[model samples]
Target chain A: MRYFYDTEFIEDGHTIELISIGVVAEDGREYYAVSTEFDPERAGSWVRTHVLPKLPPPASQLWRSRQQIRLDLEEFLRIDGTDSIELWAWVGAYDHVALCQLWGPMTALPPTVPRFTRELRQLWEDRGCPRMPPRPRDVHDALVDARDQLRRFRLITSTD
Target chain B: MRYFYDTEFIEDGHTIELISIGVVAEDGREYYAVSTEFDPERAGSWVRTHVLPKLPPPASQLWRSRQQIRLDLEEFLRIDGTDSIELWAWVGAYDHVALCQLWGPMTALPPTVPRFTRELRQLWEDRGCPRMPPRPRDVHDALVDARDQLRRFRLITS
Candidate 1:
């Protein structure tokens, strides 16, 4: 199975810290979470203005700690408990890095979560830079961006 | 078949420019080149100090143009003619990127080369991080580094 995924993160010279992650499966399942582990103070002003505003309120019922989010994600993907699944994302390098950071470091990532992300942007380029779907209404929201990528992927894969 | 490779480069916010490359095959063949495309004046002080001092003098007969290096490397790899070869390097990400940059951007690299340096490093680490051979007399030379990595690989594999 393939899953379209996205992430919001805070990056400094030394680390790329995960803020949120969203995945929408080809089978119609979805997983979404925001991490409490990230320090908003360390986020760049651009992310502060853009991504931070959209996250659930810190005290809200939807908010989950990083460990909870990590566990939930494992359960959702059945990582280590199920066969590997392919992951797709739009220009997914940072998103994939952020996802892998959940397990500590890139080398520690479970065998079930492959290192490479099937880059939709690269696929689009290889297909002659074809037209793409309109931008998602909420640009940086992980789930919304993932849904948008899924739509774009369907368009490209179906045409050629 | 297996080969070990390494590269040195100058990195800035926008570009990674190749300085030199070195490779050593399991069968003891070797390839080494320093590109004329780079301007040493633009290098960071650390690179200027550590890497520049080791090169053959800029005016020496040994220095080669990037195109010359590229063509020579193609002939050296026998790229299209030979089976794809495994590439190993110690801390290979930047080295791999520099090598890939020779053929243009990374995505355009010929299938003759595969990017598996990190896997080799990780395998080394997973097996209890054993002691290995010392580097060749020239520490920073790309070929010497590649030779050292090949030695390290043999140590790990056996």
Candidate 2:
């Protein structure tokens, strides 16, 4: 199954930490989670405004520990010791880092997980720069963003 | 003449500061210089231990201003409005950045200096990874690396 994903995080050019994640699968399975581990105070002004406001309440039940999020993802993705699904993300370098940090560093990546996340932005441009169908751009929500990525993906595929 | 060069720098991705540079030409003449400008405070733990210790003492006269380095490199390489010298380095992307930051931005690069630092790693792989001459393993010295890089570059066949 193809799984399109997105993640939000904070970084200082030295290290990256995941703040939240969303993944939408080809089978219509959707996964979304917010991590409790990230330090909100470390977030810069732009992140505090754009990303923090969109998150579930810091004390809410919706907030899960990073380990809980990791286990939930493994279960949702059906990762069973081999590359069983493809993953995609937009402009995905930092997104990929946040996603990979779920398990640990890239070296600690689970074999069951796809070794890499395909870049939707790269795919979008590589297809001769097709004009995407205009869609409503909303404030950032990982789940909303990923679900729309699938919309753009399917729409562009049909054009070719 | 084929001129292989290397640069040592401090960077946090946002900005890069040149620490020292070394260039070795095919004709055996060499150039080495240290910049007086990079912040010693910004050198993190690993840099403090490995790179900073490699330099001549802070008070040493060997250190020149970055502008002096730019001029010295220009004179040593004979950069006279023409790409008269072939330049090479090992995995030299950052080295090229530190070198260019000498003049300013990429757009500010001197018209005479090679706008590109050709990668020796590519040449090594492109020549099918030939066995290279043995060299003494020294610390992170830019001059030291340029000499060995040129040595290996000459050994690789077409």
Worst 10 residues of 1 chain B by lDDT: B114-123
Residue-by-residue lDDT tens digits, candidate 1, B2-110: 7788887876523457888888888899988888889888988778887899998868755799878888877777777746676666645445556666677434567
For residues B1-158, what per-residue lDDT tens digits would candidate 2 score against the true structure?
68988877776634557889999998899988888988889887777887887887768777999778888988988887444766777756456656766776444666666655565665575467999877656647888888988888878843
Off by over 4 Å in 2: A81-83, B1-158
Candidate 1, residue A51: Cα displacement in angstroms equals: 0.9
Clashes of each: 0, 0
lDDT of 2 at B67: 77
DockQ of each candidate relative to the true complex: 0.05, 0.06
**Ten-residue region with minimum lDDT total, candidate 1 chain A:** A100-109
